[PDB]
Design an enzyme around this catalytic site. Sequence first.
Site, PDB file in Angstrom:
ATOM      1  N   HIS A 188       0.811  -1.213   0.000  1.00 41.69           N
ATOM      2  CA  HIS A 188       0.000   0.000   0.000  1.00 41.69           C
ATOM      3  C   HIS A 188       0.849   1.269   0.000  1.00 41.69           C
ATOM      4  CE1 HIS A 188      -0.086   0.674   4.649  1.00 41.69           C
ATOM      5  NE2 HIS A 188      -0.171   1.930   4.248  1.00 41.69           N
ATOM      6  N   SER A 205       3.649   2.975   8.421  1.00 38.55           N
ATOM      7  CA  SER A 205       3.264   2.010   7.408  1.00 38.55           C
ATOM      8  C   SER A 205       4.481   1.424   6.708  1.00 38.55           C
ATOM      9  CB  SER A 205       2.355   2.679   6.366  1.00 38.55           C
ATOM     10  OG  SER A 205       1.001   2.624   6.787  1.00 38.55           O
ATOM     11  N   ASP A 242      -0.443  -7.373   2.266  1.00 35.00           N
ATOM     12  CA  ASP A 242       0.147  -6.043   2.201  1.00 35.00           C
ATOM     13  C   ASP A 242       1.661  -6.148   2.347  1.00 35.00           C
ATOM     14  OD1 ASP A 242       0.096  -3.311   1.804  1.00 35.00           O
ATOM     15  OD2 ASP A 242      -0.485  -2.828   3.859  1.00 35.00           O
TER      16      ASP A 242
HETATM   17  C1  LIG Z   1      -6.948   0.227   5.144  1.00 34.66           C
HETATM   18  C2  LIG Z   1      -8.360  -0.206   5.277  1.00 34.66           C
HETATM   19  C3  LIG Z   1      -8.395  -1.455   6.166  1.00 34.66           C
HETATM   20  C4  LIG Z   1      -8.898  -0.552   3.894  1.00 34.66           C
HETATM   21  O1  LIG Z   1      -9.267   0.611   5.813  1.00 34.66           O
HETATM   22  C5  LIG Z   1      -9.393   1.931   5.712  1.00 34.66           C
HETATM   23  O2  LIG Z   1      -9.979   2.608   6.556  1.00 34.66           O
HETATM   24  N1  LIG Z   1      -8.837   2.489   4.616  1.00 34.66           N
HETATM   25  C6  LIG Z   1      -8.081   3.730   4.763  1.00 34.66           C
HETATM   26  C7  LIG Z   1      -6.774   3.495   5.510  1.00 34.66           C
HETATM   27  O3  LIG Z   1      -6.934   3.188   6.688  1.00 34.66           O
HETATM   28  N2  LIG Z   1      -5.620   3.176   4.850  1.00 34.66           N
HETATM   29  C8  LIG Z   1      -5.687   2.879   3.424  1.00 34.66           C
HETATM   30  C9  LIG Z   1      -4.528   1.872   3.278  1.00 34.66           C
HETATM   31  C10 LIG Z   1      -3.519   2.350   4.344  1.00 34.66           C
HETATM   32  C11 LIG Z   1      -4.368   2.851   5.538  1.00 34.66           C
HETATM   33  C12 LIG Z   1      -3.751   4.107   6.212  1.00 34.66           C
HETATM   34  O4  LIG Z   1      -2.517   3.751   6.863  1.00 34.66           O
HETATM   35  C13 LIG Z   1      -2.680   3.066   8.069  1.00 34.66           C
HETATM   36  O5  LIG Z   1      -4.045   2.552   8.546  1.00 34.66           O
HETATM   37  C14 LIG Z   1      -1.414   2.885   8.840  1.00 34.66           C
HETATM   38  C15 LIG Z   1      -1.601   2.391  10.280  1.00 34.66           C
HETATM   39  C16 LIG Z   1      -2.214   3.187  11.256  1.00 34.66           C
HETATM   40  C17 LIG Z   1      -2.328   2.704  12.569  1.00 34.66           C
HETATM   41  C18 LIG Z   1      -1.881   1.422  12.901  1.00 34.66           C
HETATM   42  C19 LIG Z   1      -1.338   0.602  11.910  1.00 34.66           C
HETATM   43 CL1  LIG Z   1      -0.779  -1.020  12.293  1.00 34.66          CL
HETATM   44  C20 LIG Z   1      -1.173   1.101  10.612  1.00 34.66           C
END
Ligand SMILES: CC(C)(C)OC(=O)NCC(=O)N1CCC[C@H]1COC(=O)Cc1cccc(Cl)c1
EC number: 3.4.21.5
Lengths: 27, 249, 9
Positions: free
Chosen positions: B43, B196, B99
């Site tokens: 991602h 990330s 991922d």
């Molecule tokens: C990703 C998905 C499950 C589809 O659900 C969403 O809401 N989509 C938006 C979003 O969240 N995204 C899109 C892909 C990457 C993620 C944002 O980055 C994180 O959540 C990192 C991060 C943030 C906090 C903790 C960790 Cl381990 C990682």
Amino acid sequence: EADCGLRPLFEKKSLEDKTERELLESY
Amino acid sequence: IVEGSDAEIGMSPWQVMLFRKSPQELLCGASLISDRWVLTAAHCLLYPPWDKNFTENDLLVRIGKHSRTRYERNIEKISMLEKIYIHPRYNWRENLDRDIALMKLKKPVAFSDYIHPVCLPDRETAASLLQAGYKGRVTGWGNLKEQPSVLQVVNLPIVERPVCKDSTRIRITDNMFCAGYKPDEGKRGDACEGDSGGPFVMKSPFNNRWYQMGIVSWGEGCDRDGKYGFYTHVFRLKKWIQKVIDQFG
Amino acid sequence: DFEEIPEEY
Ligand SMILES: CC(C)(C)OC(=O)NCC(=O)N1CCC[C@H]1COC(=O)Cc1cccc(Cl)c1
Ligand code: NA
Ligand code: NA
């Protein structure tokens, strides 16, 4: 590699960082 | 990375930074798994819902860094990307299943006290240490809440799959795990935007080595009570990692 | 906010 996962400023010198025991303790 | 402590110097010598050439900016975390291979989250390079599709020449690899923004002369090393490899069944569409991604650098990087790879788990270390309650470590230059001056560190316990599935409405797979304290458990801390692709590591009590068990993948918010960080299960995609590296190398 | 990496990269 054969040497992965060993830090030069810690494991290789046998120094411990400040919170690695916290990990050990959960294991 | 949400509380979170400043790293110790050389405390995570495999920690890599995904840097954007223009505009020069932090993109993501990553890890060094060999002199010419960096491990990161798919991602971080490819995620169509946010108009993201980076190619090699758009990125730079920075290894041995402590400061987020400073150019640590004589200590960090910046490398060029020969090639990007995304998992063929990376599900960006639904839940970031698989991922994971590999990056071959153009030249081999030089090890130092600040620069050193992490191991990849084997089935026995993984069966051994991927257990609910066992704590792992996650490091990163990401947000400090939903911008740090130095690399941040946080130790988090692995969470029971049920609790994991029960905390979200998104479908969880065998290729992920979650970490984070329960609302109960007094302590908090989490990965957040920016970390990330960064590594989740554990120290084997068996051989004293550090292994990357997980890749920072996704969360709903950061450090929300009852929510957990979800990490790519590295041992699971190992055959893909092996295959990729034993051939394009 | 990122200090200038060398031009040679
Ligand atoms: C990703 C998905 C499950 C589809 O659900 C969403 O809401 N989509 C938006 C979003 O969240 N995204 C899109 C892909 C990457 C993620 C944002 O980055 C994180 O959540 C990192 C991060 C943030 C906090 C903790 C960790 Cl381990 C990682
Ligand atoms: Na659910
Ligand atoms: Na939480």
